[PDB]
Design a binder for these strands. Structure first.
Ligand code: ATP
Ligand code: ATP
Ligand code: ATP
Ligand code: MG
Ligand code: MG
Ligand code: MG
Ligand code: MG
Ligand code: MG
Ligand code: MG
Ligand code: MG
Lengths: 320, 34, 321, 34, 321, 34
DNA sequence: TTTTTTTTTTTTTTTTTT
């Protein structure tokens, strides 16, 4: 819903441009935003803010809906194929739009390869399992490689030039820049249709930006704000969100019950914010193991997927 | 599948669906056993 | 309960009833429990009219002293909702209790949302088996509601999936103000049809980000106290079970080593004092989970083991052992 | 079990119970030892 | 790169610039990449002045989005440094890539320092033969640097030994603090004159002894993370190829029998994630050595054989076969 | 190959490049199939 | 012309060795 629909009942274009400069680009963003943040905007009065809130509430519903209608609505949600039948079976058709998916594991587990595969496959038509929309990439480690995108698009028969042109790329150098890039991303997705957002990696900058136990609270709260903004963007635009995370080995071997001494970074905030969590491990050769850790609707299981020059796929009999 | 399956605008353009939801919400409770 | 329409006596106009309904008061109990200040804050209400309304509400709703024997025999007839697990049912002494606040806290993948779904679907079965025979209301603050689980569990209990889905109301909150405002709509809805369960998953999710810094801590705590007071008042009015979900964080200050668990729930003292019963959840082996009663005015401290299967929460099987 | 066990309407609809409560409250104290 | 002197606009004084230079920031890119907190904590800068500096830096260098095609065509022109061996060039798809972190890990006597010595010379030959046409910087933490090898390698490539020795800067670190502090002088040196290669051999030579025990592990890991992050800023600023050498350790706990190699590089998750590319070295027969790619965002896993001779690292000869 | 390929000064010196990037980012989405 | 009252309220993990 365009924000220009708010140009009624004494609302001035200056108010709309101020809201756009403040990061709000759609009526849904205005509706979701609380009154406190609206009051923080310069040149906005309490009565004008109340009028804006009422107008937004009129445009988008916020009441109670029966479970049957919600179920039939979610039954039509778009799922993006990952190029592997095993992954699609484990995720029940692929990654789900409007939800946060996290991939965690050690290095050389192919998380970036899966991100590239998702970025390229978001452009193929729906009947094959795509999303038919542009992709947005935020890189925090300088590991983006367009060669993989070109090769994988060659696998799917897409035009490499169009595939490269339909993918937007950006790099963040600090936590503040990473948070600030979200405003530009929201503006771009308001001006044109997108389907996928990829963040690799979320916790790379926070490890060095914040120092000591004294700054732990600030780092955790900044991460919470970043994930809240990501979730707001996700349910505002309905695009899939994928984030990658690192791991750390726990020195204290007190919890010997868990055979794996590696746990993802971010702690409780990171664990609670993410809707779905997938852990990655390395097998033999090009094979890798993917395990669902947390999911509101999926059982715990494992799958095997291989990485080849054309991207992520099902393991071949030669690898068995 | 639809481009705007979860978009709130889909609910805005169908007042009949909202009326049906409101009617079903306040209809008298019954035992859900055949 | 007592409908508010009984207040249309002794010169009370229907416009006053409309004003009260618009102000959030929908039952005679709501008028009786409301203090003088809140009534005076309503536009178009005179002091004499407020006094007359208070007198009429007190006449209909008894508010005096009652001997403990009658209170005991009254509480002995409360409806308790089964959780689908006999091991967990024994610890609760018959299941969750209507007219009370139950809180579940723990880390992720501990099955709190699964238990909430099981309670939401089991409140419709006949009470002779352990149900409540009423509609359920769901408020989601994390976008984690999944009707597929409800359909599966309803299939487990031999219930019609269509009616089970139709008997559950669902809503999502995007900010603290909207979450608080949804209670008005919930109260309006329950005044027309019989409900038995209200679930909030999760209470503390939005307040963590909505209020920023140490300076805004007081406002956040005041808002949370207001929300919990509203929940308690609603439960008292309609006598429905209330279940809330809470998150947990690790206390970095490892100076005290007496408690082996370095994780404590979010909410501070307000959540601890307001909630009536508290249950902590931990992950066991496989699909098994551990539940522990932390605070309860009637139940002793103990632990229990349950499990999660495709058909919901239940007792662990010998295969998992 | 009753759907409105704790409802105030149950107490309001039974004046005899209220009269019994009032009578028991003001009855003289006795030692509860048999 | 844009010099910091261009920043003295719109009320910016020379005193602020000299204070920033004393603080370690020598380029406008350093100011742009610097977070607001770190810029503000420096004494002598106001919040408004810091905001003005950030705005000017954002104006000078781009920080927004860009299409993938333009990034790909820009990356296609990146300079790769030849290593003197055709097998290694084929394995790496051109040679050592500038602007990325390359790690060489393996046992002793495997020739890790030989590749660094070869790159110290090949970084000065003209671009047409895979060179860099820039000065080299060397950081030594084990007392292994030997100019004789550099002279021999320069003789192999036909470069003047005097010019080759004069075009390379050498420094030695004695502790972790000195190792980190050397980067401050290195940034100024590379800002005053053009450089193309930085070599660190080895990164964890001092960290193993400086920090001991489980209590000091967190501080050591954090210090290593800060060192690698500073290296990443430096590489991004100047676009010079960064090469680091690492040692190996034998895992006593043979629980993970799936891995036939009982030796793994030290550093843990920080070292694993920080490095963009990782190459493992093993000893072959005679002068032959085996190089294997472990982690690479764009290269497949493979192995190759390279020989070491008096003139440096090269392709194996038929006599050594 | 260029000595200042990945340097940020290259983009700042070509405003036409930035204008083309902005125009390409804002063009409407099309299916990348011939 | 006179003549003060009276506190609230918690956050939040890190990290291998041999
Ligand atoms: N072109 C390629 N062809 C085949 N395999 C490749 C190719 N590029 C990379 N790989 C494989 O992928 C691995 C690294 O993949 P990727 O970078 O996605 O891993 P990751 O675990 O997510 O890493 P990081 O933590 O560094 O981001 C390589 O070690 C290699 O096995
Ligand atoms: N259909 C299912 N069959 C089996 N296990 C399932 C099923 N759906 C979910 N699970 C399991 O239930 C767990 C997640 O439960 P739940 O969503 O209630 O988590 P939670 O601990 O309450 O966390 P949250 O804070 O994310 O709500 C996971 O272990 C998941 O594998
Ligand atoms: N002048 C030389 N001519 C030929 N071969 C040499 C010469 N100097 C060294 N070597 C070879 O190189 C080996 C040592 O190489 P180098 O010091 O690079 O190894 P390394 O594995 O990196 O060592 P470290 O772990 O001690 O740094 C010698 O054992 C020898 O085989
Ligand atoms: Mg990767
Ligand atoms: Mg979860
Ligand atoms: Mg849950
Ligand atoms: Mg208590
Ligand atoms: Mg040696
Ligand atoms: Mg050596
Ligand atoms: Mg890597």
């Amino acid at each position: 819903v365009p924000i220009e629909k708010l140009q009624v009942n004494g609302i001035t274009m200056a108010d709309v441009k101020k809201l756009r400069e403040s990061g709000l680009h759609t009526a849904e963003a205005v509706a979701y935003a609380p009154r406190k943040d609206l009051l923080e905007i310069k040149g906005i009065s309490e009565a004008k803010a109340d009028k804006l809130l009422n107008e937004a509430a009129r445009l988008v519903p916020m009441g109670f809906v029966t479970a049957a209608d919600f179920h039939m609505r979610r039954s039509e949600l778009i799922c993006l194929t990952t190029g592997s039948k095993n992954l699609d079976t484990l995720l029940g058709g692929g990654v789900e739009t409007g939800s946060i998916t996290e991939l965690f594991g050690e290095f050389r587990t192919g998380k970036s390869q899966l991100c590239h595969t998702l970025a390229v496959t978001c452009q193929i038509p729906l009947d094959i399992g795509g999303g038919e929309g542009k992709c947005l990439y935020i890189d925090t480690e300088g590991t983006f490689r367009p060669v993989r995108l070109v090769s994988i698009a060659q696998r799917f028969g897409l035009d490499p030039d169009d595939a490269l042109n339909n993918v937007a790329y950006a790099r963040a150098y600090n936590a503040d820049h990473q948070l600030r890039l979200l405003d530009a991303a929201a503006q771009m997705m308001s001006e044109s249709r997108f389907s996928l957002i990829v963040v690799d990696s979320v916790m790379a900058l926070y490890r060095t930006d914040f120092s000591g136990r004294g700054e732990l609270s600030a780092r955790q709260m900044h991460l919470a704000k970043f994930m809240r903004a990501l979730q707001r963007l996700a349910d505002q635009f309905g695009v899939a969100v994928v984030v990658t995370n690192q791991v750390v080995a726990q020195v204290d071997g007190g919890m010997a019950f868990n055979p794996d001494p590696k746990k993802p970074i971010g702690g409780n905030i990171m664990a609670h914010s993410s809707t779905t969590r997938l852990g990655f491990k390395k097998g033999k050769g090009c094979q890798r193991l993917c395990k669902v850790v947390d999911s509101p609707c999926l059982p715990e299981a494992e799958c095997v997927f291989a990485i080849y020059e054309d991207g992520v796929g099902d393991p071949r009999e030669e690898d068995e | 599948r639809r481009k705007d399956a979860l978009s709130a605008q889909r609910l805005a353009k169908d007042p009949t669906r909202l009326s049906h939801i409101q009617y079903t919400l306040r209809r008298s409770f019954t035992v859900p056993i055949k």
